[PDB]
């Protein structure tokens, strides 16, 4: 899940817009 | 658990900003 | 407006602290 | 929605609980 | 008043890099 | 109150620390 | 180390919206 | 104190409200 | 007054986000 | 500045990219 | 690791405090 | 700079300003 991903290795503004609605 | 609990206000601060007027869900996880 | 988007920022905050494991849905509308 | 609920008057931690999934 | 609750958030955030080791009071 | 003086007008790093402990 | 500085920041902005008008000591 | 006892274990909102006047 | 500076530290965190590891100056000139 | 410009109306993060180094 | 970029963040929120007259340049 | 300088241990308010224009 996000938390996952983005506090492994920096999520950039595209890889955060995915988990917009 | 704390350094993901810190992590994760970083997180939905910054959805929050790239998200805007369309908002998101946060689902743990 | 402005104010809102100040608003929802600290909005955002207080439901990841509320909301803990269950975590949120942030709609601004 | 919460914005209309909550960015004039306070809500509470509990009227947060509403906007949990 | 949200104005004064959001700024009450900013204020502790800044007491708190501004007291240091001392802390402080927040008393509304 | 800290509140009426620092949200009614601007306050210096200088003037919050009266404020602290 | 800097971490406990930084929890610390989160911290107090949480007991700013757990206790709301009762106030708190922060205290290290 | 708070510190010793919340940043190095996630403290809940009621674990925090032990820290309220 | 009180809040534009509020606004600011928003601001800033904005700028934060979108620059990274670039980095930003700020000026309120 | 900046601030005027930003905290009248709001700014997107595609705006503020170009004030990044 | 993301510990640098969350460390930032906080850097960015206390020179913005600090520089108030003239602002700050940051840079990673 | 400021990260190798401030993100390893605490910088004071006062080491801060070396980051002022
Ligand atoms: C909740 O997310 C459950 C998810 C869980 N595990 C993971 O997603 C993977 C592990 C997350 C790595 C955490 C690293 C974060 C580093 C944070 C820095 C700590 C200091 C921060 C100081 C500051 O506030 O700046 C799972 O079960 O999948
Ligand atoms: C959407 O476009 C907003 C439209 C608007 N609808 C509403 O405002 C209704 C929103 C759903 C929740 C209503 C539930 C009503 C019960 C009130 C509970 C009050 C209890 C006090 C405690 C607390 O605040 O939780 C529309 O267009 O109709
Ligand atoms: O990968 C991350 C984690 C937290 C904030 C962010 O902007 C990116
Ligand atoms: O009514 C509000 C608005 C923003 C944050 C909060 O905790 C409550
Ligand atoms: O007057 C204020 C109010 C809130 C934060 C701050 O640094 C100053
Ligand atoms: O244990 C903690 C540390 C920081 C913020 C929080 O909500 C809880
Ligand atoms: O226009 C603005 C003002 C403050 C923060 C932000 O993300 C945008
Ligand atoms: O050393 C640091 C790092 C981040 C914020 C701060 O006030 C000090
Ligand atoms: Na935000
Ligand atoms: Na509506
Ligand atoms: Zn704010
Ligand atoms: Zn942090």
Redesign the interface.
């Known amino acids: 899940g996000i938390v996952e991903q983005c506090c492994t290795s920096i999520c950039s503004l595209y890889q955060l817009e995915n988990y917009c609605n | ?29």
Request: charged share 15%; hydrophobic share 40%; proline share 3%.
């Open positions: 658990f704390v350094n993901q609990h810190l992590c994760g206000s970083h997180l939905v601060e910054a959805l929050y900003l790239v998200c805007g007027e369309r908002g998101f869900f946060y689902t743990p996880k």
